[PDB]
Each structure stands twice: as structure tokens, then as C-alpha cells.
Amino acid sequence: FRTFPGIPKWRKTHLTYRIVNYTPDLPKDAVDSAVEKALKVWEEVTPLTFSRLYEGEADIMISFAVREHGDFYPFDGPGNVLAHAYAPGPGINGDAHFDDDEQWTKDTTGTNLFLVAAHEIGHSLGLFHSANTEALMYPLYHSLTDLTRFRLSQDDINGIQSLYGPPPD
Amino acid sequence: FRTFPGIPKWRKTHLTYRIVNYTPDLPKDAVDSAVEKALKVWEEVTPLTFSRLYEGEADIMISFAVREHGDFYPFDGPGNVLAHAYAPGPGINGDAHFDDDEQWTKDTTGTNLFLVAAHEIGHSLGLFHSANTEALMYPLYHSLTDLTRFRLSQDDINGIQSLYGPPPDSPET
Ligand SMILES: COc1ccc(S(=O)(=O)N2CC(C)(C)CN(S(=O)(=O)c3ccc(OC)cc3)C2C(=O)NO)cc1
Ligand SMILES: [Ca+2]
Ligand SMILES: [Ca+2]
Ligand SMILES: [Ca+2]
Ligand SMILES: [Ca+2]
Ligand SMILES: [Ca+2]
Ligand SMILES: [Ca+2]
Ligand SMILES: [Zn+2]
Ligand SMILES: [Zn+2]
Ligand SMILES: [Zn+2]
Ligand SMILES: [Zn+2]
């Protein structure tokens, strides 16, 4: 697994999240679930907890964009870059953006929102890419068995635990 | 009645529109419905017709935004600027952006999406801010606790018809 240089990690245990907008591809509720499960998978292996904001600046701001949005790294159209997120920090950091030029799906018939969201939140928490092919942080993300047989690899667990530790309670 | 500097218009009579993303404030078909009705307002008084695209580039790309969102003018936040649209033309021209930091609503409890959208798609069709106080194109979001009976003012109609003219099937007073 890999951790960014000078291991930037959140100082606090509890983090807030906000879903800024919604994609036309899926029902709003499907988006919420994909995100809730994406956060759930990291939450159950570390002492981190999450709560949701509907206004104000949350630590992890989540949105869907196309091409040039509010940053210096515009999206590239359908395929290739599917989404990108920022390492721990104030402001733009921690935030995760998803490319709407992709077809976000509930299953594996387009770009599965769950698989990719879990990976991106990885970035938001301090994790960089892993060289292990079976790890969630391997830049293949949606190219996995999906949650029928999906399971965080011990590599992902080791990587996030090197930053925040295992669950105490 | 006031128009844009240069006076741009659309050469095509039929325009396409697309809802790029959705607001967490309202359910999906509610947003859609406020947009159809905002387009109907201008159709009734001109020979302009509209169609909805679900992919690709439509003339009027409609989206909800917050602060820096990829164009020349960032949204301020929970207040003041509620939305902004671009004059007719290619690219970002003719598009409408709605400040999501506002509480979009189907009624008068927050910021009525229909009311503002009708004002914006005025901009997307070539109208600028009016001087008349009773005109939709006047830049004042009204604190009217009445909205059930909506009508385009005569100077809105006078403005949009000087760019496109009256409907072919409508008799004139
Ligand atoms: C290019 O033509 C435009 C000129 C100014 C603006 S603006 O975004 O700067 N803003 C200027 C002003 C603060 C004077 C009023 N509001 S608004 O958001 O509060 C507004 C929005 C809808 C509305 O519908 C009744 C009335 C006011 C608008 C504006 O004009 N938007 O277009 C937008 C388009
Ligand atoms: Ca942030
Ligand atoms: Ca892409
Ligand atoms: Ca999409
Ligand atoms: Ca356009
Ligand atoms: Ca505002
Ligand atoms: Ca809102
Ligand atoms: Zn981005
Ligand atoms: Zn990645
Ligand atoms: Zn804008
Ligand atoms: Zn205006």
C-alpha cells in the first residue's frame, strides 16, 4: 500500500460529508447508499466515524462534474479518468469529484459508483495507490467482483490502519 | 424591455435543453417540471419550440452549482446572486446555472425554481434586465406571497417578440 509524502492525515476522528449534487444516471437514493457503504467500508476498520451535512462546508464534499469544474484538473469526457479526490486538509482537500460523462451504475453494467467511491474516499483519508493488484486502492477500482464477493484486502486495511489504527471499540 | 449588447439571437427556431445535474433540495421530476414550465412560458409567446436531450451538447445546458464551478463567475453563497445565464450563442452561451447554496422550492418558502428559471431562460434567449418593475426580466426576486396566477408582462412579451416574433397560430389583438 502507499501513503502520501509526509503522511498527511486528518487530526480528528469524526469527519463530516456532504453530497453537493446528483447525477441524472441514478435515483438520488441510490447515490446516497453508494456513498454510505463507501464510507462504511473504511469506518469499520478504523476508529473513524462519519456524519452528514446538508449545508455548510463538510470535510468531504462530494459532487458530479464534467470537464472544467471548480479546480485546475478538468475531467476528460467518457472513460479514462472516472473520478478524483484530494488528500486530507481544509478547503478543497478531502473533496471527491465524479465524472458525469461516465454512466454511474448500481451494478457492474456501467461504472459502479460504490467501487469507485470507496477508492476515492481512500484518497480523501490519506491513501495513495497500491501496487497490489487485489487492493481497492489499486487504480482499477470498478474492475472488481463487486459486493457479492468484494472485501477490503488486508493491504487496504494495513494501509488505513497505519494512519488511524484499528477499531478500539 | 432591454436586450443584450450586440443583440444576439438564435437562428434556429427549435432549441434543445439538458438537465446536467440535480439539486438535493427537490426530487428529480420536480426540477424537470419546473424547467418544462419555465420553457412553456416563452413558447406561448413566440414561435420557439424546445426539446430535451439526455446526452451530448444541448443549446441550453442547465446545472446547479456552488462557489467556483468552472466558469467566469463564481457563486457567492447562501444569498444575493441566486442564478445566472448566458446570452445566445455556442458553448457556454445560452446555458443556465443555479446557485445550489439556495433552498430551491416548488412554492414560495425558499427560492422558487420556476420563477428564477423563467428569468434565466429569458437571458438564454436574448433578454437583458428590464426597467419595468412588473416585468419578469426586472432583476428583483419578489417577496410576493402570491404566485398561483403567473403571467408574462407585456414588456417581457414585447422584448422576446422583437427577437423572434409572435406565434404563427395566434390571432393578434
Ligand atoms: C448576463 O446577464 C446577467 C446579468 C447579471 C446577472 S447576476 O447573476 O449577476 N445577478 C444580478 C443581480 C444581483 C442584480 C440579481 N440576480 S438574482 O440572482 O438575485 C435574480 C435571479 C432571478 C430573478 O428572477 C426573477 C431575479 C433576480 C442576478 C440575475 O440577474 N440573474 O439573472 C445574471 C445574468
Ligand atoms: Ca474539504
Ligand atoms: Ca472521464
Ligand atoms: Ca452520467
Ligand atoms: Ca450552450
Ligand atoms: Ca448566492
Ligand atoms: Ca440547495
Ligand atoms: Zn475536480
Ligand atoms: Zn485513485
Ligand atoms: Zn456559472
Ligand atoms: Zn438576471
**Radius of gyration of chain A measured on its C-alpha atoms:** 15
For this PDB entry, the determination method is: X-ray
CA of residue A84 to ligand 8 center, whole Å: 6
What is the DSSP secondary structure assignment for residue A115, as one 8-state letter?
H
What is the DSSP secondary structure assignment for residue A125, as one 8-state letter?
H
Closest approach of B84 to chain A, Cα-based (Å): 16
Q: How far apart are CA A13 and CA A15, in angstroms?
A: 7
User: Are A166 and A158 within 8 A, CB to CB?
Assistant: no
CA–centroid distance for A151 within its chain: 15
Which amino acid is it at B145? T
Nearest to A113 by CA among A146, A138, A71, A139: A146
Length of chain B: 173
DSSP count for chain B of H helices, then E strands: 3, 7
- Which residues of chain A neighbour B17 with C-beta distances below 8 Å? none
- For residue B67, the chain A residue with the least C-alpha distance is A70
Q: Are strands A2-3 and A127-128 parallel, antiparallel or unpaired?
A: antiparallel
Question: Whose grid coordinates read 494495513?
Answer: A158
Q: Residue A102, SS3? A: coil
Question: Whose grid coordinates read 428569468?
Answer: B119
H helices of B26-153, in order, are 28-43, 113-125
Rounded alpha-carbon distances, angstroms, from residue A99 to A79, A96, B77: 9, 10, 24
Cell readout for A134 is 487485489
- Which residues of chain B neighbour A70 with C-beta distances below 8 Å? 67-70, 74
DSSP, residue by residue, A65-115: E-SS-SSSS---SSSS--EEE--SSSTTTT-EEEETTS-EESSTTSEEHHH
Q: Give domain limits for chain B.
A: 1-173
Atom of ligand 1 nearest to the CA of B85: 34
Question: Whose grid coordinates read 480528528?
Answer: A12
User: Are A140 and A11 within 8 A, CB to CB?
Assistant: no
Cell readout for A19 is 453530497
Cell readout for A120 is 476515492
Residues with CB under 5 A from ligand 6 (ion): B 76, 81, 99
CA of residue B46 to ligand 8 center, whole Å: 40
Q: How far apart are CA B58 and CA B117, in angstroms?
A: 17
Pocket residues: Cβ below 6 A from ligand 1: B 80-85, 115-116, 119-120, 123, 139-141
Which residue out of A17, A18, A20 would a mutagenesis test of the B interface target, given it has the greatest number of B Cβ atoms within 10 Å?
A: A20
What is the DSSP secondary structure assignment for residue B22, as one 8-state letter?
B
CATH class of the domain at B1-173: alpha beta
Check if CATH label 3.40.718.10 holds for domain A1-169.
no
User: Are B81 and B75 within 8 A, CB to CB?
Assistant: yes
Which residue out of A21, A23, A28, A69 would a mutagenesis test of the B interface target, given it has the greatest number of B Cβ atoms within 10 Å?
A: A21
Q: How far apart are CA A136 and CA A1, in angstroms?
A: 10
Q: Does the beta-carbon distance from B24 to A22 stay under 8 Å?
A: yes
CA of residue B76 to ligand 10 center, whole Å: 11
- Which residues of chain B neighbour A95 with C-beta distances below 8 Å? none
Residue ranges of E strands in chain A: 2-3, 14-19, 49-52, 60-65, 83-85, 96-99, 104-105, 111-112, 127-128
B68 assigned to active site? no
